[PDB]
């Protein structure tokens, strides 16, 4: 599913990303824009055989299991395919696990480069939230 901007904002707020771990909602919508262009089916293959999945391009070497790199971690304890679902629950829950302890949204380089320090509230502007 390719979400509309406000539609994604609405779904992320319903799943609790608004102000999660110090990050206002716009941060998450902006990260998703630059990671997947809001497409839940986005995937990208890496040189180590892992794959990045979903609206937030979560990596299979660490966060989910796809069975393609035996011995890798599945820190979110989910099949990577759940991260391609039109229902963003699995991506949201895993993203909350990623941003915990000393791991901030810097874990997403595109967020750091394209969103951090910008007027992120603009991503939710005009949305029925």
């Amino acid at each position, epitope marked *: 599913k390719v979400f509309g901007r406000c539609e994604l904002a609405a779904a992320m707020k319903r799943h609790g990303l608004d102000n999660y771990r110090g990050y206002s909602l716009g941060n998450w919508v902006c990260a998703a824009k630059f990671e997947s262009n809001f497409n839940t089916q986005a995937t*990208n293959r*890496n040189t*180590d*055989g*892992s794959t*990045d999945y979903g609206i*937030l391009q979560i990596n299979s070497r660490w966060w989910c299991n796809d069975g393609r790199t035996p011995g890798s971690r599945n820190l979110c304890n989910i099949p990577c395919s759940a991260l391609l679902s039109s229902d963003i629950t699995a991506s949201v829950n895993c993203a909350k696990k990623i941003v915990s302890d000393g791991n901030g949204m810097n874990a*997403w380089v*595109a967020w750091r480069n394209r969103c951090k320090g910008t007027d992120v509230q603009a991503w939710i502007r005009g949305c029925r939230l």
Partner: nanobody
Amino acid sequence: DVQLQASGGGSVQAGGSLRLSCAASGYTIGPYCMGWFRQAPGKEREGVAAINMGGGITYYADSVKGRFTISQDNAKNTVYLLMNSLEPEDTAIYYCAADSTIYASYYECGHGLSTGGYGYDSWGQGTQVTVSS
């Protein structure tokens, strides 16, 4: 509290080899990257080699390609740098480094090698390597 401890190195004649090793302590998960940087007398620190702990993909500075080999032992959080065909120009203080961020999407550990160590938040004290002329 992250701590990187390296050993190996020392002095050698040009054409010789040395093997450096580095152990990270204090992590429960990660590091994501481990690498080697070096700083010759009076010079800026520069990158040498890096490796993704997740996947083992390696990255080398053009100055050591084909001569140095970086490797890892993920379960033991240790990284190694095999240095063959050493030259006087390789003399320097060598530093073990690690990036502790567990990136969400795939991250190439070689990125920090040429951007002044960007992302490498932990550093060893430095190990001397001296290659005779």
